[PDB]
Amino acid sequence: GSSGSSGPDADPVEIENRIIELCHQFPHGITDQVIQNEMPHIEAQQRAVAINRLLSMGQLDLLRSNTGLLYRIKDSGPSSG
Questions:
Q1: Which of 11, 15, 53, 74 has the highest Cβ tally under 10 A?
Q2: At the topology level of CATH, where does 10-74 sit?
Q3: Helices (DSSP H) in the chain: which residue ranges?
């Protein structure tokens, strides 16, 4: 739930891209906690924003499993025939 402008704090694209690089490192996915240890400097809204963005953009894939959600690299399985 975006709330007002964020501000000049760590560009968005950058944040997103960062997540991408991660989503790449982890094919299984990445937990908010991870991104936290990876970027504990990022903001709550910034972290989500980028996430939501990637989610929408179609670059990041959300995966609801166990406590919290998971985020992996977006992709689609190959056809059978």
A1: 15
A2: Arc Repressor Mutant, subunit A (1.10.10)
A3: 12-25, 32-38, 44-57
The experimental method behind these coordinates is NMR
Q: How many CB atoms lie within 10 A of CB 15?
A: 23
Q: Which of 46, 71, 50, 76 is nearest to 60 (CA)?
A: 71
**Residue linked to tokens 């985020």:** 71
Give exposure, 17-52, as e/b (b: 16+ Cβ within 10 Å). Answer: ebbbebbeeeeebbbeebbeeebeebeebbbebbbb
Report which DSSP code applies to 68. Answer: S
CA-based nearest residue to 45, from 34, 53, 57, 55: 53
The residue among 28, 46, 26 whose CA lies nearest residue 36 is: 46
Sheet containing strand 69-73, edge to edge, reads 30-31, 69-73, 60-64
